[PDB]
Symmetry: C2
Subunit: 140 residues, 2 copies
């Protein structure tokens, strides 16, 4: 798995078209969301992660947790993202791991948001620009 | 080299602290910039690119050009970015290639912006969310 972390003043999104033929169902509420003072985790779930979804999930949970604690973010947002890897896991594996990472951050005590899987999404983000505000991690 | 391309309604930035001890000099004007309807190229120049800066530059010029033409962007912004690679080129190599990619997009006919090298930068971006609006390319 590859992860890009962005410590943002705000992060806002609007679901546009479906990217999968059968995406994650969503309510009309879940078409748009916004959080402030948020660590945004853009996550590319990879083929190799099929091998051990829970180990990879636990690791991702922890690495994101550390950065949130370090930059003093209480808010965390989990986003699926294709763009840190050309070796992507099947959608079941991707949704599995995404949901585990989300549940684990909730259990850590963060106020966690997530994006629906299988859509094109419009995104507005304001990235802070202090030294720890954009970080990448590789998790295998 | 790895490149992330984002077709944006707008892209705005403010230079914050220096990341290098001796960054690219800038005027007080160049501390902030904004473009609209813009393809933003986040570029991670890599160690392997030292081997042949011009080939890699020409390739990057072309791949960014194709996407701009395809999404109908007249505006292109070139940004250095550490986050698509854990094998980064020295600053001379990085600045070299960045400047070549910038000059080549100018010669193609685009209205091109660039970000100063060696700083932490605060960024606001609105990503479109249509199918071609976020793309990655690997160039070696």
């Amino acid at each position: 798995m590859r992860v890009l972390l962005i410590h943002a003043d705000y992060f806002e999104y609007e679901v546009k078209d479906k990217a999968l033929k059968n995406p994650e169902p969503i309510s009309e509420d879940m078409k748009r969301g916004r959080m402030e003072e948020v660590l945004v985790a853009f996550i590319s779930v990879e083929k190799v992660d099929e091998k051990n979804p829970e180990e990879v999930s636990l690791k991702a949970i922890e690495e994101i947790s550390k950065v949130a604690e370090q930059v003093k973010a209480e808010n965390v947002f989990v986003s699926p993202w294709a763009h840190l890897s050309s070796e992507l896991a099947k959608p079941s594996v991707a949704m599995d791991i995404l949901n585990r990472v989300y549940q684990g951050l909730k259990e850590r005590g963060f106020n966690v948001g997530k994006a629906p899987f299988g859509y094109y999404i419009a995104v507005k983000i304001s990235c802070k620009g202090h030294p720890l505000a954009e970080l990448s991690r590789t998790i295998v």
